[PDB]
Design an enzyme around this catalytic site. Structure first.
Site, PDB file in Angstrom:
ATOM      1  N   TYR A  24       0.678  -1.182  -0.240  1.00  0.00           N
ATOM      2  CA  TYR A  24       0.034   0.411  -0.439  1.00  0.00           C
ATOM      3  C   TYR A  24       1.110   1.110  -0.402  1.00  0.00           C
ATOM      4  CZ  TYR A  24      -4.675   1.996   1.397  1.00  0.00           C
ATOM      5  OH  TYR A  24      -5.905   3.305   0.582  1.00  0.00           O
ATOM      6  N   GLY A  25       1.715   0.707  -0.845  1.00  0.00           N
ATOM      7  CA  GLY A  25       2.816   2.702  -1.116  1.00  0.00           C
ATOM      8  C   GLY A  25       2.584   3.693  -2.258  1.00  0.00           C
ATOM      9  N   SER A  26       2.869   4.119  -2.960  1.00  0.00           N
ATOM     10  CA  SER A  26       2.232   4.544  -4.113  1.00  0.00           C
ATOM     11  C   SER A  26       1.653   4.254  -5.412  1.00  0.00           C
ATOM     12  CB  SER A  26       4.376   4.862  -5.067  1.00  0.00           C
ATOM     13  OG  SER A  26       3.578   6.204  -6.002  1.00  0.00           O
ATOM     14  N   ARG A  48       3.484  -6.639   7.706  1.00  0.00           N
ATOM     15  CA  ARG A  48       3.623  -5.633   9.481  1.00  0.00           C
ATOM     16  C   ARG A  48       2.743  -4.490   9.735  1.00  0.00           C
ATOM     17  N   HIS A 107       5.012  -3.992 -12.853  1.00  0.00           N
ATOM     18  CA  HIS A 107       6.592  -3.361 -13.666  1.00  0.00           C
ATOM     19  C   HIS A 107       6.939  -4.648 -14.018  1.00  0.00           C
ATOM     20  CE1 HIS A 107      10.395  -1.921 -15.108  1.00  0.00           C
ATOM     21  NE2 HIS A 107      11.034  -1.843 -13.839  1.00  0.00           N
TER      22      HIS A 107
HETATM   23  N1  LIG Z   1       6.309   4.572  -7.778  1.00  0.00           N
HETATM   24  C1  LIG Z   1       5.529   4.193  -9.033  1.00  0.00           C
HETATM   25  O1  LIG Z   1       4.387   5.744  -9.224  1.00  0.00           O
HETATM   26  C2  LIG Z   1       5.310   3.500  -9.738  1.00  0.00           C
HETATM   27  C3  LIG Z   1       4.772   3.638 -11.712  1.00  0.00           C
HETATM   28  C4  LIG Z   1       4.552   2.418 -11.942  1.00  0.00           C
HETATM   29  C5  LIG Z   1       5.023   1.438 -11.560  1.00  0.00           C
HETATM   30  N2  LIG Z   1       5.878   0.850 -10.203  1.00  0.00           N
HETATM   31  C6  LIG Z   1       5.725  -0.263  -9.409  1.00  0.00           C
HETATM   32  O2  LIG Z   1       4.894  -0.202  -9.189  1.00  0.00           O
HETATM   33  C7  LIG Z   1       5.400  -0.864  -8.396  1.00  0.00           C
HETATM   34  C8  LIG Z   1       6.005  -0.824  -6.772  1.00  0.00           C
HETATM   35  O3  LIG Z   1       6.182  -0.022  -6.599  1.00  0.00           O
HETATM   36  P1  LIG Z   1       6.029   1.126  -5.710  1.00  0.00           P
HETATM   37  O4  LIG Z   1       7.388   2.455  -5.687  1.00  0.00           O
HETATM   38  O5  LIG Z   1       4.685   1.389  -5.840  1.00  0.00           O
HETATM   39  O6  LIG Z   1       6.611   0.399  -4.080  1.00  0.00           O
HETATM   40  P2  LIG Z   1       6.472   1.533  -2.617  1.00  0.00           P
HETATM   41  O7  LIG Z   1       5.539   2.522  -2.828  1.00  0.00           O
HETATM   42  O8  LIG Z   1       8.136   1.029  -2.517  1.00  0.00           O
HETATM   43  O9  LIG Z   1       5.689  -0.045  -1.525  1.00  0.00           O
HETATM   44  C9  LIG Z   1       5.524  -0.089  -0.643  1.00  0.00           C
HETATM   45  C10 LIG Z   1       4.464  -0.535   0.002  1.00  0.00           C
HETATM   46  O10 LIG Z   1       5.578  -2.286   0.254  1.00  0.00           O
HETATM   47  C11 LIG Z   1       5.809  -1.949   1.576  1.00  0.00           C
HETATM   48  N3  LIG Z   1       6.891  -2.687   1.600  1.00  0.00           N
HETATM   49  C12 LIG Z   1       8.559  -2.321   1.557  1.00  0.00           C
HETATM   50  N4  LIG Z   1       9.637  -3.051   2.369  1.00  0.00           N
HETATM   51  C13 LIG Z   1       9.648  -3.813   2.781  1.00  0.00           C
HETATM   52  C14 LIG Z   1       9.312  -5.051   3.217  1.00  0.00           C
HETATM   53  N5  LIG Z   1      10.958  -5.355   2.813  1.00  0.00           N
HETATM   54  N6  LIG Z   1       8.652  -6.293   2.825  1.00  0.00           N
HETATM   55  C15 LIG Z   1       7.067  -6.132   2.520  1.00  0.00           C
HETATM   56  N7  LIG Z   1       6.724  -5.159   2.200  1.00  0.00           N
HETATM   57  C16 LIG Z   1       7.427  -3.884   2.231  1.00  0.00           C
HETATM   58  C17 LIG Z   1       5.625  -1.454   2.388  1.00  0.00           C
HETATM   59  O11 LIG Z   1       4.965  -1.169   3.731  1.00  0.00           O
HETATM   60  P3  LIG Z   1       5.636  -0.518   4.795  1.00  0.00           P
HETATM   61  O12 LIG Z   1       4.831   0.333   5.172  1.00  0.00           O
HETATM   62  O13 LIG Z   1       5.215  -1.505   6.004  1.00  0.00           O
HETATM   63  O14 LIG Z   1       7.004  -0.233   4.661  1.00  0.00           O
HETATM   64  C18 LIG Z   1       4.597  -0.636   1.505  1.00  0.00           C
HETATM   65  O15 LIG Z   1       2.850  -1.201   1.755  1.00  0.00           O
HETATM   66  C19 LIG Z   1       7.167  -1.767  -8.363  1.00  0.00           C
HETATM   67  O16 LIG Z   1       6.841  -3.275  -9.211  1.00  0.00           O
HETATM   68  C20 LIG Z   1       7.142  -0.564  -8.913  1.00  0.00           C
HETATM   69  O17 LIG Z   1       8.510  -0.634 -10.056  1.00  0.00           O
HETATM   70  C21 LIG Z   1       5.951   2.361  -9.456  1.00  0.00           C
HETATM   71 MG   LIG Z   2       9.483   2.381 -13.066  1.00  0.00          MG
END
Ligand SMILES: NC(=O)c1ccc[n+]([C@@H]2O[C@H](COP(=O)([O-])OP(=O)(O)OC[C@H]3O[C@@H](n4cnc5c(N)ncnc54)[C@H](OP(=O)(O)O)[C@@H]3O)[C@@H](O)[C@H]2O)c1
Ligand SMILES: [Mg+2]
Ligand SMILES: CC(C)NC(=O)C(=O)O
Ligand SMILES: [Mg+2]
EC number: 1.1.1.383
Length: 466
Positions: A24-26, A48, A107
């Site tokens: 539940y991040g970005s 967690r 991704h």
């Molecule tokens: N960011 C972008 O805009 C973007 C664009 C397109 C595609 N993507 C893709 O989308 C996917 C997700 O990326 P994101 O940037 O959205 O992810 P993110 O925001 O970095 O993910 C954070 C989430 O992952 C959990 N997390 C962090 N470390 C962890 C661990 N060691 N074990 C289990 N859970 C953990 C966090 O929980 P806590 O709160 O408990 O730490 C939180 O729920 C990736 O494949 C990325 O390449 C991202």
């Molecule tokens: Mg990317």
């Protein structure tokens, strides 16, 4: 290529499936909220009770623990950081999922680089929004959307693509446009785009412009404002009307300045460096280097973030944005018009020359830049960097300074000096006496160009009913 919109896509293939959003991040928050608003059945799975658990509860979800969410899921989406997915898969998904449940990514990194080998009896597919996560949500809630790629790695149902398209519709992306792609193409173009332009390139260009204005004697608040405001104006014009539309919106003098300065500041050597970046991606060298960094604790990422957050440029930007909230240069125009135009053009053409779908290249290197620059304008570089993936942070930090190296602020300085002295004005007055051949010749080459002909078609389809 077909660009799918809402009227092309049925939700029926996913209507009664339980969709587990892992993370539940970005992206995770955006998908979960959007899918729930679209009427689909969502559960949030987390390892967690940390920051994102608290966020999800505040949004009206009751998160389950990862293993419990996947036990009841028909569709499992990996929206945790790329470097974390293997461990989550091995420890909390593989031995706990329903047999035959869909495995879904945003991704292609883990599947394409063979980090995760899925079971043979699951659909494996992807919806990759071409947007930072927060704008996936923000667009949706304003009644719009962002473009997305879909891809199918493994089809076992025979309807994996239809399910990918349904999810893309569910998160709002078919309001803008969805294109079919592959895991290889998505991964390679995505890493390229974020490294050279969307994160790395634009960030270093903004810093270079800021530093250069400050060295020339502008007050920091003015250097910041001139840089980011002109960036937004120029990128918004391109987003709406392409390079030709942007150029037609500025003075003939600025056209000529943009065209010539751009190729000076962003020269062939930069095109070569973009190919180097792409080959490092294609060959797997970037992936191996990122994995090694991650296994060290991402010290490069943590360092850069903390230096950026404390930096002069970010302090000044925060103060400026706050004063504007609370109500309180023609050289810079041409440097940015040039720099941004040629950075876009070089990035786009690198992908097209290398054989990728031009529509994908447009979403990645042109369309998405507007979404990024909107985040930077609203929340500064630090806000943008927080919104993008860890993979993109690391790519941007390492590649940005390669693409936009020290010499670029040196060239900026030279250009700025010629402007301030009235030398740029004499030089415009001259080319003008030749009948502006450099300007007409460029307009002529742009008119026929792939970037403009594809862009115009896509922009028409995208802004249909948005
Ligand atoms: N960011 C972008 O805009 C973007 C664009 C397109 C595609 N993507 C893709 O989308 C996917 C997700 O990326 P994101 O940037 O959205 O992810 P993110 O925001 O970095 O993910 C954070 C989430 O992952 C959990 N997390 C962090 N470390 C962890 C661990 N060691 N074990 C289990 N859970 C953990 C966090 O929980 P806590 O709160 O408990 O730490 C939180 O729920 C990736 O494949 C990325 O390449 C991202
Ligand atoms: Mg990317
Ligand atoms: C620029 C960024 C939003 N795009 C991504 O693909 C990512 O964050 O990894
Ligand atoms: Mg991306």
């Amino acid at each position: 290529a077909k660009i799918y919109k809402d009227e092309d896509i049925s939700l029926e293939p996913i209507k009664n499936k339980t969709i587990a959003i892992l993370g539940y991040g970005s992206q995770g928050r955006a998908w979960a909220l959007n899918l729930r608003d679209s009427g689909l059945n969502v559960v949030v799975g987390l390892e967690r009770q940390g920051d994102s658990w608290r966020r999800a509860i505040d949004d009206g979800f009751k998160p389950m623990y990862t293993k419990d969410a996947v036990a009841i899921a028909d569709i499992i989406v990996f929206l945790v950081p790329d470097m974390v997915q293997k461990s989550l898969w091995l420890n909390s998904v593989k031995d706990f999922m329903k047999k035959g449940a869909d495995l879904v990514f945003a991704h292609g990194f883990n599947i394409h680089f063979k980090i995760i080998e899925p079971p043979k009896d699951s659909d494996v597919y992807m919806i990759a929004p071409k947007s930072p996560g927060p704008i996936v949500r923000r667009s949706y809630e304003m009644g719009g959307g962002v473009p997305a790629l879909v891809a199918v790695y493994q089809n076992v149902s025979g309807e994996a693509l239809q399910k990918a398209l349904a999810i893309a519709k569910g998160i709002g992306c078919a309001r803008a446009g969805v294109i079919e792609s592959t895991f290889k193409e998505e991964t390679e173009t995505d890493l390229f785009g974020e490294q050279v332009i969307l994160v790395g390139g634009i960030m270093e260009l903004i810093k270079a412009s800021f530093e250069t204005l400050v060295e020339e004697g502008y007050q920091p608040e003015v250097a910041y404002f001139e840089t980011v405001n002109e960036l937004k104006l120029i990128v918004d014009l391109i987003y709406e009307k392409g390079l030709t539309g942007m150029l037609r919106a500025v003075s003939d003098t600025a056209k000529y300045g943009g065209i010539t300065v751009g190729k000076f500041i962003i020269d062939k050597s930069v095109r070569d460096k973009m190919k180097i970046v792409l080959e490092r991606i294609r060959s797997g060298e970037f992936a191996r280097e990122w994995i090694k960094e991650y296994e060290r604790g991402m010290p490069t990422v943590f360092k850069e973030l903390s230096e950026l957050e404390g930096s002069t440029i970010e302090t000044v930007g925060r103060k400026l944005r706050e004063m504007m909230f609370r109500g309180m240069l023609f050289g810079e125009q041409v440097i940015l018009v040039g720099g941004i135009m040629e950075l876009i053009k070089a990035s786009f053409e690198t992908l097209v020359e290398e054989g990728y779908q031009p529509e994908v290249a447009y979403f990645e290197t042109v369309n998405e830049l507007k979404l990024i620059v909107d985040l930077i304008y609203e929340k500064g570089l630090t806000g943008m960097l927080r919104a993008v993936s860890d993979t993109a942070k690391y790519g941007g930090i390492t590649v940005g300074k390669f693409i936009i190296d020290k010499s670029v602020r040196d060239k900026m300085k030279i250009v700025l000096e010629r402007i301030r002295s009235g030398e740029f004005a004499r030089e415009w007055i001259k080319e003008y006496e030749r009948g502006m051949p450099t300007v007409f010749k460029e307009l002529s080459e742009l008119e026929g160009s792939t970037i403009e002909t594809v862009g115009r078609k896509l922009r028409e389809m995208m802004f249909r009913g948005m």
